[PDB]
């Protein structure tokens, strides 16, 4: 049955802030995205310079 | 002979990756070129204006140019004439042509020195060793008239008699003009003459390293970010049994 | 038409009128024994070399049959103490030392 | 060649996580170094021998050249 | 090598009734190839130093084998190019071909680029028209408010048309035809 | 006026490598000069000596120069 | 800030060697 | 899209696949810097060397553009040899059309770099021009005529320099067009990958995966290039070219540009004119024969240990040739060079194909 | 023992570390592409998965745990009968072409 299909554990790859399956990850999504967005903006300024 | 003697490495103050030329040394080195080397060697690609902001002020360089006379013209009568030199003039050539140069030097041709440092393996280490390296011929060696034994010159027989020695000139800053001091400054000047962009390229080098020090880890982080989706993907094969 | 046009263009790359053979006069007194003198002639080094008796003798002793381009020294000079040559290596054109 | 017309694949399941849900350097050093060491060992017997041979010919040759230019080699 | 060489030429569907006015497009292509070939052969003998430019052109015409024919073909080729250009544009205006908007606008850019190319080529021999043509035409930029003068001197590489100008005009003249292609 | 080069050279010539090189050179001088006919000269021995000495000089000399 | 900071580092590494550093000795306008 | 962004790419191509985009970047950087140099360079033999020094001394930032062009040529070759090496090791040459166009690209870049090197009219420029054009003299009956025709005279002179500037100027653009065809042919099959096994079952979009890896690779190329330009601009060059051309004197230790040393070592290894020119030409054209000498049932060397050893022997041998080319024609270098030259052709023509067959037998096919 | 050296070579070759079978590594020419097309569904789907798994490992520069490496003694040619026939058919056509 397709219902036997289960996503494998990814705990070994997850950022620490999304390790608790009983907590919403939206609470850290802004920070998680902000970081990546900081890297991009800075790369762009460096390249423009 | 076919044997070779390579110059050792001197600790030039401009030897380091971020190390600029010593401009006071360039200033003295120019004096050496002016009083000594210029009577036999041209420096075709260097002009008085090039010295401004490097080792002399504009007024000092103007006074230096004026110390010489250069041909100009034709004038209204179609005549060439002499005038005091100016900033735009290139350093005067000791000879009208290489033939005259050879004739005045027992057949040997003093090369132009604008690039001597870049045109010789060893650079200033070579020029310095050559200049301070004359000695008596070793036993068994006899050089034809006009040649001098210099162990650093290819073949060891050079047509330039030792050009410098203690007190060959007086420096404008009182610096003791020993032969080695004179060699060190003229070598510094020759480096500058062959590579005036020397200091600027190292300053840009510093900025380039700093920028790459930032941009490389950032782009690498972006690469790892995007690729993480593939790096952690898991595969399962579920064929119907 | 094509043959003419193409050859005219190909011809433009060949030596122009200004490039095409004046003789040259050389003063032998100015060349000391043992010296190889080079001159620019017809756009190439011309060597005029004053040989010593030892050089002349060594060249005489060469086992000619074993040379890749067999010639006796005396077939190459008019006066043994003088060897005159086009100073261009027959391999790829450099100037022999 | 475009996606949709590459080839026939059946019964394969792929699971992936958004990049924002995961570390970009998971076990960078703890697992990275070991893997680099495995990969190095896996090839050195194939890559190194020729360069050691070069290194040997080079030092021998250079030294042989120097010895041949002096009076008493 | 089949297609685009495929269905792109041989089996290209063409109106059965296009007249001679439709020949100018291929003629422009031929003028372009003629200019490029003669130009390249001239570039093989031309020097852009103001002290040798005029002389190198006379050398081409006098001493280079068939240099005179290659030189005059290049010069008159430019004129033929323009005759064809104007006929081509005229055909487009009369027949409403400009309704092919993209084709027509790229055409307008081609016209401006060929004009700039011919202008620069004309400066290369460094005769009187070359010099004054270079002075006047580059100076058109000086009509630009406040920066026009700066632009002109920048193009010239100095305060007047001189050595720097001729050398860069040879490089621009060299590459533009390929961009035009 | 004393050129530090002279001083530095004397101190450097004290090193064993230079004394050894100097000895092979003096030996060569003796050998060569004692002949009337020889194609030999002492360039090799001199270069060996200068190489050892100048390597040392290079490490010190600039400390005495402006 | 990058340019000024970098130049400062460069000039410090080369203290007393650059023209800007010895210039006063010859000027006096 | 379906030309770039959505281009299907193997999910596992490594850093060795970055060199194609790096070559493209090298080409563009050479073209841009070259164009700016052409704006100040004059090809008259009386002003060529001087105009280069003027660029380096009085043109604003002329020195940086000049040294970027010079070191750019070196970076170009480093990338070229890596690119070819990748293709040989992974069996990429089985994409016949792409590979053969590649061989033509190699010869064209070599011709281009050679001519550019003549432009400053230094000693290496003059003698390089003399020697290389003279390779054509080895052609029976018409060789000498061809040389003089190329030269525009009986010796390298004014006519030669002027036409070399024009050829140097246009060839890069021709190279660019040919490189575009090189790519068109590659897109028909898509890229090969380290395993040499079809990757149609695991393709990923070119963007963002390889667009970002390419940018990273490009940054490292710029880093390598600028480290040379700003900290060691002359490291890879020859001091002899800082001396104006002298047609009456060939420097005694003259040697080719570093990226030509191996071929030079090979030509120099043969004491016969025609023999050396034929071996020089073959050392490059043998590339076009590699596809025909492939005996292995597997495409890539990844799974072929014996082939790998030979491959690395070949790389070490090219390093040996590169080193020998930089040495005088004296013992023991003459013999090492002849052995290395023999080994080169032996590895490619006999040993590798043989190893291919032996591996097939070991795997029972 | 030729077989001693064979098993040594098999492991040195190392495609087994990526869980591949020898036939999974064959260079795909036209004969091979036709043989693959003729494979029964299960063998075809298996080949596809072993290659996908290998490409994925290669991408990560990783290999399988040693217990999962294809074993020399177990690797058999699933492609041979199909490929041999495809090659015999083509040889036959060529003979007729020569006539
Ligand atoms: C890109 C393709 C390159 C290939 C070469 C293109 C050649 C084009 C073919 C020409 C067709 C037009 C006919 C012209 C008739 C000219 C008559 C002629 O040839 O007279 C010969 C005469 C020399 O005579 P003599 O010096 O006294 O002595 C000769 C004995 N040694 O040469 C000439 O008059 C030169 C003629 C110049 C032709 C103009 C060049 C045209 C080139 C165009 C290239 C593009 C393609 C166009 C398509 C072709 C359509 C026909
Ligand atoms: C041309 C003349 C120029 C002179 C030659 C000088 C060359 C100097 C050597 C530089 C080469 C760098 C070597 C670093 C590579 C080391 C390495 O990692 O090798 C092992 C590694 C194992 O990889 P896989 O089999 O795919 O398995 C993956 C398992 N995780 O092998 C590779 O990376 C293979 C890729 C090599 C291709 C590039 C080789 C360098 C090229 C040099 C010259 C090329 C030859 C042809 C020139 C003729 C004209
Ligand atoms: C004329 C009396 C000279 C004076 C004064 C100086 N030099 Fe000279 N120099 C001269 C000749 C004739 C030669 C040619 C030597 C030969 O046999 O070829 C030289 C050579 C040099 C060299 C180049 C050596 C080489 O490797 O080719 C250098 C770098 C050099 N000279 C430097 C130099 C400097 C800096 C001088 C002033 C301190 C100087 N020379 C003076 C003749 C004369
Ligand atoms: C659309 C293409 C081209 C046009 C319209 C064109 C036009 C011109 C013009 C009007 C002149 C002046 C001719 C004269 O009166 O002497 C000229 C000169 C020149 N052109 Fe071009 N040209 C073209 C392409 C090229 C190309 C591709 C090159 C070089 C690769 C080239 C090289 C030269 C040279 C060297 C001269 C100087 C010699 C001379 O004046 O004849 N041209 N060109
Ligand atoms: C001006 C020089 C060249 C340019 C710009 C160029 C560019 C490229 C590019 C962009 C790619 C795809 C990316 C990659 O796989 O690296 C590529 C692939 C390829 N190139 Fe080149 N190339 C050049 C010269 C050559 C040469 C000289 C050869 C070989 C003699 C060659 C053989 C190949 C092959 C076989 C491929 C596919 C490799 C694979 O898929 O594994 N290229 N090239
Ligand atoms: C495949 C691209 C190219 C390669 C590999 C290349 C390489 C070189 C090389 C090796 C030199 C000698 C540099 C030196 O040591 O001084 C050179 C010189 C030169 N190149 Fe290029 N070049 C390329 C493209 C171009 C282009 C497109 C132009 C011009 C439109 C150009 C213009 C010049 C000029 C004017 C010189 C003489 C000035 C100099 O020596 O730097 N090159 N080139
Ligand atoms: C670096 C490159 C640059 C700056 C190129 C810019 C090119 C601009 C234009 O092309 C797009 C331009 C050629 C085009 O204007 C639309 C022409 C119709 C200009 C026509 C033109 O010619 C003259 C000319 O030739 C002369 O020669 C002796 C003399 C001239 O007066 C004394 C003129 C003149 O008064 C005008 C209006
Ligand atoms: C009009 C255009 C023409 C005629 C272009 C032809 C180009 C031919 C080839 O490219 C395809 C050629 C560049 C390529 O041969 C495969 C190179 C590897 C040749 C390498 C090469 O370099 C040398 C060199 O650079 C030198 O400089 C100082 C000096 C040299 O000996 C003294 C050489 C030399 O002995 C060889 C073999
Ligand atoms: C990146 C590795 C560079 C190796 C350092 C030495 O590099 C060599 O230096 C010689 C003169 O010093 C040059 O004539 C030669 O062309 C150059 O390759
Ligand atoms: C490149 C050298 C190839 C030598 C053939 C390898 O031979 C193999 O070596 C293994 C480990 O030593 C042994 O366990 C194995 O029984 C033997 O057949
Ligand atoms: C890419 C090359 C495709 C080759 C397709 C071969 O196809 C085969 O040809 C045989 C002829 O001997 C037929 O008897 C057989 O039924 C057919 O499947
Ligand atoms: S040995 Fe080759 S040109 Fe003389």
PDB file of N, CA, C and O in Angstrom, chain H residues 60-92:
ATOM      1  N   UNK H  60      45.933  55.220 -18.560  1.00  0.00           N
ATOM      2  CA  UNK H  60      45.354  54.975 -17.244  1.00  0.00           C
ATOM      3  C   UNK H  60      44.974  53.515 -17.137  1.00  0.00           C
ATOM      4  O   UNK H  60      44.220  52.996 -17.966  1.00  0.00           O
ATOM      5  N   UNK H  61      45.520  52.847 -16.127  1.00  0.00           N
ATOM      6  CA  UNK H  61      45.256  51.432 -15.908  1.00  0.00           C
ATOM      7  C   UNK H  61      45.701  50.552 -17.073  1.00  0.00           C
ATOM      8  O   UNK H  61      45.334  49.379 -17.150  1.00  0.00           O
ATOM      9  N   UNK H  62      46.511  51.123 -17.966  1.00  0.00           N
ATOM     10  CA  UNK H  62      47.007  50.348 -19.089  1.00  0.00           C
ATOM     11  C   UNK H  62      47.787  49.127 -18.621  1.00  0.00           C
ATOM     12  O   UNK H  62      47.683  48.047 -19.187  1.00  0.00           O
ATOM     13  N   UNK H  63      48.566  49.285 -17.561  1.00  0.00           N
ATOM     14  CA  UNK H  63      49.357  48.172 -17.075  1.00  0.00           C
ATOM     15  C   UNK H  63      48.481  47.019 -16.622  1.00  0.00           C
ATOM     16  O   UNK H  63      48.795  45.861 -16.884  1.00  0.00           O
ATOM     17  N   UNK H  64      47.381  47.321 -15.940  1.00  0.00           N
ATOM     18  CA  UNK H  64      46.552  46.236 -15.467  1.00  0.00           C
ATOM     19  C   UNK H  64      45.862  45.501 -16.602  1.00  0.00           C
ATOM     20  O   UNK H  64      45.692  44.289 -16.539  1.00  0.00           O
ATOM     21  N   UNK H  65      45.478  46.233 -17.639  1.00  0.00           N
ATOM     22  CA  UNK H  65      44.809  45.628 -18.780  1.00  0.00           C
ATOM     23  C   UNK H  65      45.831  44.773 -19.537  1.00  0.00           C
ATOM     24  O   UNK H  65      45.542  43.650 -19.943  1.00  0.00           O
ATOM     25  N   UNK H  66      47.042  45.299 -19.695  1.00  0.00           N
ATOM     26  CA  UNK H  66      48.087  44.582 -20.396  1.00  0.00           C
ATOM     27  C   UNK H  66      48.456  43.289 -19.667  1.00  0.00           C
ATOM     28  O   UNK H  66      48.551  42.227 -20.271  1.00  0.00           O
ATOM     29  N   UNK H  67      48.668  43.357 -18.366  1.00  0.00           N
ATOM     30  CA  UNK H  67      49.064  42.139 -17.667  1.00  0.00           C
ATOM     31  C   UNK H  67      47.930  41.139 -17.502  1.00  0.00           C
ATOM     32  O   UNK H  67      48.183  39.948 -17.363  1.00  0.00           O
ATOM     33  N   UNK H  68      46.690  41.624 -17.542  1.00  0.00           N
ATOM     34  CA  UNK H  68      45.531  40.741 -17.498  1.00  0.00           C
ATOM     35  C   UNK H  68      45.486  40.003 -18.840  1.00  0.00           C
ATOM     36  O   UNK H  68      45.199  38.824 -18.886  1.00  0.00           O
ATOM     37  N   UNK H  69      45.767  40.706 -19.932  1.00  0.00           N
ATOM     38  CA  UNK H  69      45.747  40.058 -21.225  1.00  0.00           C
ATOM     39  C   UNK H  69      46.848  38.994 -21.269  1.00  0.00           C
ATOM     40  O   UNK H  69      46.614  37.877 -21.701  1.00  0.00           O
ATOM     41  N   UNK H  70      48.046  39.331 -20.802  1.00  0.00           N
ATOM     42  CA  UNK H  70      49.146  38.377 -20.835  1.00  0.00           C
ATOM     43  C   UNK H  70      48.907  37.165 -19.941  1.00  0.00           C
ATOM     44  O   UNK H  70      49.052  36.016 -20.369  1.00  0.00           O
ATOM     45  N   UNK H  71      48.529  37.406 -18.697  1.00  0.00           N
ATOM     46  CA  UNK H  71      48.291  36.298 -17.804  1.00  0.00           C
ATOM     47  C   UNK H  71      46.984  35.604 -18.128  1.00  0.00           C
ATOM     48  O   UNK H  71      46.787  34.431 -17.791  1.00  0.00           O
ATOM     49  N   UNK H  72      46.102  36.317 -18.819  1.00  0.00           N
ATOM     50  CA  UNK H  72      44.841  35.724 -19.223  1.00  0.00           C
ATOM     51  C   UNK H  72      45.158  34.610 -20.214  1.00  0.00           C
ATOM     52  O   UNK H  72      44.552  33.540 -20.173  1.00  0.00           O
ATOM     53  N   UNK H  73      46.118  34.851 -21.103  1.00  0.00           N
ATOM     54  CA  UNK H  73      46.499  33.835 -22.079  1.00  0.00           C
ATOM     55  C   UNK H  73      46.997  32.581 -21.327  1.00  0.00           C
ATOM     56  O   UNK H  73      46.704  31.455 -21.721  1.00  0.00           O
ATOM     57  N   UNK H  74      47.743  32.769 -20.242  1.00  0.00           N
ATOM     58  CA  UNK H  74      48.217  31.611 -19.477  1.00  0.00           C
ATOM     59  C   UNK H  74      47.068  30.854 -18.806  1.00  0.00           C
ATOM     60  O   UNK H  74      47.040  29.620 -18.813  1.00  0.00           O
ATOM     61  N   UNK H  75      46.126  31.599 -18.234  1.00  0.00           N
ATOM     62  CA  UNK H  75      44.964  31.008 -17.580  1.00  0.00           C
ATOM     63  C   UNK H  75      44.152  30.247 -18.602  1.00  0.00           C
ATOM     64  O   UNK H  75      43.581  29.201 -18.299  1.00  0.00           O
ATOM     65  N   UNK H  76      44.077  30.809 -19.805  1.00  0.00           N
ATOM     66  CA  UNK H  76      43.351  30.193 -20.899  1.00  0.00           C
ATOM     67  C   UNK H  76      43.940  28.802 -21.141  1.00  0.00           C
ATOM     68  O   UNK H  76      43.218  27.827 -21.205  1.00  0.00           O
ATOM     69  N   UNK H  77      45.258  28.714 -21.270  1.00  0.00           N
ATOM     70  CA  UNK H  77      45.873  27.417 -21.531  1.00  0.00           C
ATOM     71  C   UNK H  77      45.772  26.443 -20.387  1.00  0.00           C
ATOM     72  O   UNK H  77      45.645  25.248 -20.613  1.00  0.00           O
ATOM     73  N   UNK H  78      45.827  26.935 -19.157  1.00  0.00           N
ATOM     74  CA  UNK H  78      45.724  26.028 -18.025  1.00  0.00           C
ATOM     75  C   UNK H  78      44.348  25.371 -18.090  1.00  0.00           C
ATOM     76  O   UNK H  78      44.211  24.154 -17.897  1.00  0.00           O
ATOM     77  N   UNK H  79      43.336  26.192 -18.370  1.00  0.00           N
ATOM     78  CA  UNK H  79      41.966  25.719 -18.471  1.00  0.00           C
ATOM     79  C   UNK H  79      41.820  24.794 -19.686  1.00  0.00           C
ATOM     80  O   UNK H  79      41.121  23.788 -19.611  1.00  0.00           O
ATOM     81  N   UNK H  80      42.476  25.133 -20.796  1.00  0.00           N
ATOM     82  CA  UNK H  80      42.396  24.298 -21.991  1.00  0.00           C
ATOM     83  C   UNK H  80      42.912  22.886 -21.707  1.00  0.00           C
ATOM     84  O   UNK H  80      42.234  21.912 -21.999  1.00  0.00           O
ATOM     85  N   UNK H  81      44.113  22.787 -21.144  1.00  0.00           N
ATOM     86  CA  UNK H  81      44.704  21.486 -20.841  1.00  0.00           C
ATOM     87  C   UNK H  81      43.885  20.690 -19.809  1.00  0.00           C
ATOM     88  O   UNK H  81      43.827  19.478 -19.891  1.00  0.00           O
ATOM     89  N   UNK H  82      43.268  21.372 -18.841  1.00  0.00           N
ATOM     90  CA  UNK H  82      42.434  20.689 -17.852  1.00  0.00           C
ATOM     91  C   UNK H  82      41.208  20.127 -18.589  1.00  0.00           C
ATOM     92  O   UNK H  82      40.824  18.965 -18.413  1.00  0.00           O
ATOM     93  N   UNK H  83      40.612  20.984 -19.417  1.00  0.00           N
ATOM     94  CA  UNK H  83      39.422  20.671 -20.207  1.00  0.00           C
ATOM     95  C   UNK H  83      39.680  19.426 -21.086  1.00  0.00           C
ATOM     96  O   UNK H  83      38.881  18.493 -21.099  1.00  0.00           O
ATOM     97  N   UNK H  84      40.797  19.416 -21.804  1.00  0.00           N
ATOM     98  CA  UNK H  84      41.157  18.280 -22.660  1.00  0.00           C
ATOM     99  C   UNK H  84      41.418  17.044 -21.810  1.00  0.00           C
ATOM    100  O   UNK H  84      40.971  15.955 -22.149  1.00  0.00           O
ATOM    101  N   UNK H  85      42.143  17.225 -20.708  1.00  0.00           N
ATOM    102  CA  UNK H  85      42.427  16.121 -19.806  1.00  0.00           C
ATOM    103  C   UNK H  85      41.138  15.491 -19.299  1.00  0.00           C
ATOM    104  O   UNK H  85      41.001  14.269 -19.271  1.00  0.00           O
ATOM    105  N   UNK H  86      40.177  16.323 -18.906  1.00  0.00           N
ATOM    106  CA  UNK H  86      38.892  15.823 -18.425  1.00  0.00           C
ATOM    107  C   UNK H  86      38.265  14.967 -19.520  1.00  0.00           C
ATOM    108  O   UNK H  86      37.810  13.848 -19.263  1.00  0.00           O
ATOM    109  N   UNK H  87      38.241  15.501 -20.737  1.00  0.00           N
ATOM    110  CA  UNK H  87      37.658  14.789 -21.863  1.00  0.00           C
ATOM    111  C   UNK H  87      38.328  13.443 -22.143  1.00  0.00           C
ATOM    112  O   UNK H  87      37.662  12.469 -22.497  1.00  0.00           O
ATOM    113  N   UNK H  88      39.645  13.377 -21.999  1.00  0.00           N
ATOM    114  CA  UNK H  88      40.347  12.121 -22.239  1.00  0.00           C
ATOM    115  C   UNK H  88      40.044  11.089 -21.147  1.00  0.00           C
ATOM    116  O   UNK H  88      39.792   9.929 -21.445  1.00  0.00           O
ATOM    117  N   UNK H  89      40.094  11.524 -19.890  1.00  0.00           N
ATOM    118  CA  UNK H  89      39.876  10.644 -18.758  1.00  0.00           C
ATOM    119  C   UNK H  89      38.449  10.123 -18.689  1.00  0.00           C
ATOM    120  O   UNK H  89      38.233   8.957 -18.387  1.00  0.00           O
ATOM    121  N   UNK H  90      37.478  10.977 -18.995  1.00  0.00           N
ATOM    122  CA  UNK H  90      36.079  10.551 -18.900  1.00  0.00           C
ATOM    123  C   UNK H  90      35.451   9.995 -20.162  1.00  0.00           C
ATOM    124  O   UNK H  90      34.294   9.573 -20.145  1.00  0.00           O
ATOM    125  N   UNK H  91      36.214   9.961 -21.247  1.00  0.00           N
ATOM    126  CA  UNK H  91      35.682   9.409 -22.477  1.00  0.00           C
ATOM    127  C   UNK H  91      34.750  10.361 -23.188  1.00  0.00           C
ATOM    128  O   UNK H  91      33.948   9.942 -24.027  1.00  0.00           O
ATOM    129  N   UNK H  92      34.861  11.649 -22.873  1.00  0.00           N
ATOM    130  CA  UNK H  92      33.997  12.639 -23.495  1.00  0.00           C
ATOM    131  C   UNK H  92      34.210  12.722 -24.994  1.00  0.00           C
ATOM    132  O   UNK H  92      33.325  13.129 -25.713  1.00  0.00           O
TER     133      UNK H  92
END
